[PDB]
Amino acid sequence: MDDIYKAAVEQLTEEQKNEFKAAFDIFVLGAEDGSISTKELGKVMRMLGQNPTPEELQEMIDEVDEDGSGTVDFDEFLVMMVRSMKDDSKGKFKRPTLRRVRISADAMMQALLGARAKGHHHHHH
Ligand SMILES: NCCCCCCNS(=O)(=O)c1cccc2c(Cl)cccc12
Ligand SMILES: [Ca+2]
């Protein structure tokens, strides 16, 4: 990924990396290679209530696939989380376009992370 994103991944503390790593494992749940691909990508999207097609799944991976690997590995999935975090920027001018569907990284992470304790009423989630 980008040098900046790469640094961001390394910057994350043990807890931060562990927190993100949880999504990676869940994302590649059953993944033979262990990386997140379109098949795995769609699985996570389904959990979030999204059902993107294979074409969309590959495109989504490309977003975090600077190397054009086509898949989101441990370092790649971390970049996605970092990308959304950016310099504390969210954006609201994007509006529904060239997609019509917007999924927040934080919301997605909670969907994947929220599979153990709590999750019934968030509360400090
Ligand atoms: N404010 C949100 C920041 C934008 C970055 C999130 C991307 N938003 S996204 O809809 O393209 C998206 C959602 C969930 C998982 C994704 C995976 Cl595993 C790969 C690629 C895209 C993914
Ligand atoms: Ca990659």
Would you write up a description of this structure?
- With 125 residues, this protein is mainly α.
- The chain has one domain.
- Helix content is 52%, strand content 0%.
- The chain contains 6 helices and no strands.
- The longest helix has 14 residues, at 14-27.
- It is classed as metal binding protein.
- Keywords: EF hand, calcium desensitizer.
- The assembly is monomeric.
- The entry is titled "NMR structure of the cNTnC-cTnI chimera bound to calcium desensitizer W7".
In short:
It is built from 6 helices and no strands.
- Strand percentage lies at under 5%
Oligomer: monomer
Helix content: 40-55%
> Tally of extended strands?
0
Chemical compounds bound to the protein? N-(6-aminohexyl)-5-chloro-1-naphthalenesulfonamide, calcium ion
Number of domain units: 1
Largest sheet: none
User: What is the overall shape?
Assistant: globular
Please write the string of helix (H) and strand (E) elements.
HHHHHH
Number of helices: 6
Tell me the span between the first and last alpha carbons. 28 Å
* SSE-based structural type: mainly alpha
Radius of gyration, CA atoms, in whole angstroms: 14 Å
